Amino acid sequence: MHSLLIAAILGVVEGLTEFLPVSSTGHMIIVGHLLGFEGDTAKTFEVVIQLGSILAVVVMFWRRLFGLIGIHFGRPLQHEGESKGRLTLIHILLGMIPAVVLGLLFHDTIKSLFNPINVMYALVVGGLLLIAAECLKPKEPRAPGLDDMTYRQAFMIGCFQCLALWPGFSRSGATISGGMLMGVSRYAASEFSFLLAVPMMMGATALDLYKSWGFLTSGDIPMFAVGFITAFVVALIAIKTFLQLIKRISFIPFAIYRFIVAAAVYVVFF
Ligand SMILES: CCCCCCCC/C=C\CCCCCCCC(=O)OC[C@H](O)CO
Numbered sequence: 001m002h003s004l005l006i007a008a009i010l011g012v013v014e015g016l017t018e019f020l021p022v023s024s025t026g027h028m029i030i031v032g033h034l035l036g037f038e039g040d041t042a043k044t045f046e047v048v049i050q051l052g053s054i055l056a057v058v059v060m061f062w063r064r065l066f067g068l069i070g071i072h073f074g075r076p077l078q079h080e081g082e083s084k085g086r087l088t089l090i091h092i093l094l095g096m097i098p099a100v101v102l103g104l105l106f107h108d109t110i111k112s113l114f115n116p117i118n119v120m121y122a123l124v125v126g127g128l129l130l131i132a133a134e135c136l137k138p139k140e141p142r143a144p145g146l147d148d149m150t151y152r153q154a155f156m157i158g159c160f161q162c163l164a165l166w167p168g169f170s171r172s173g174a175t176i177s178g179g180m181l182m183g184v185s186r187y188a189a190s191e192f193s194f195l196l197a198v199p200m201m202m203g204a205t206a207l208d209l210y211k212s213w214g215f216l217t218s219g220d221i222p223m224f225a226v227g228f229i230t231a232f233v234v235a236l237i238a239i240k241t242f243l244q245l246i247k248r249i250s251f252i253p254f255a256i257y258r259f260i261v262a263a264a265v266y267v268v269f270f
Pocket residue numbers: 012013014016017020022027245248249253254257
């Protein structure tokens with residue numbers, strides 16, 4: 001069946017690219033164009049399989065996420081840092097504030113940048129940003145572990161998340177670049193962007209799901225669900241592999257891969 005085969009393909013695409021700094025949105029417009037799945041019903045499909053990849057972070061950081069909102073499951077939480085500090089909900093809130101304000105104020109304007117030419121630019125520019133963060137970051141990270149992050153690092157990563165409102169720029173790309181430029185290690189910066197994505201994306205999809213709720217029907221449920229859990233399985237493999245891969249690899253190959261994806265956006269759409 002075409003409808004479910006496509007749902008599984010977009011599902012693997014979403015689950016790989018959503019948290020890799022490679023622009024899930026960019027990959028979605030190419031593949032959706034190559035599959036023929038591009039209508040209003042596709043943009044609502046591609047936002048609900050985002051919740052699938054969301055759930056993966058939720059599963060992977062279950063005990064950490066609940067500890068931030070005050071629910072400690074009767075065991076000490078695992079410590080990830082060189083200091084006696086602990087990531088707190090304030091870190092998350094500072095990481096959310098700038099992009100929330102800017103995203104609210106400029107909603108209509110942001111929506112009008114969803115062109116394929118803007119996504120092409122955001123792939124190149126965000127790749128350059130990754131290169132710059134890799135070239136400019138300190139020799140010795142100030143926050144080697146997630147629990148070493150400061151309010152200032154969290155807030156600055158939060159301002160960098162405004163760049164993510166640029167369609168194609170990749171939320172994880174913006175926030176990991178900012179993290180490394182603020183002396184956060186690749187690993188903790190990845191971890192912090194995944195944690196930050198949870199409130200960000202769950203309010204993003206909820207917002208999109210409300211404004212686009214009219215499209216959903218009874219028959220979407222088969223398609224909407226095959227993509228959802230595909231994005232969940234793939235994201236769980238992607239995130240766990242990425243967190244182990246980035247320990248040894250840098251972001252240069254992702255930046256270069258972004259440039260190849262930019263070329264594809266031009267080949268496919270122009
Ligand atoms: C859904 C469309 C496809 C999704 C696109 C995914 C993006 C990956 C692109 C570039 C990263 C390349 C880096 C990953 C390759 C590393 C493999 C490897 O073996 O490197 C490990 C190294 O040996 C350490 O010890």
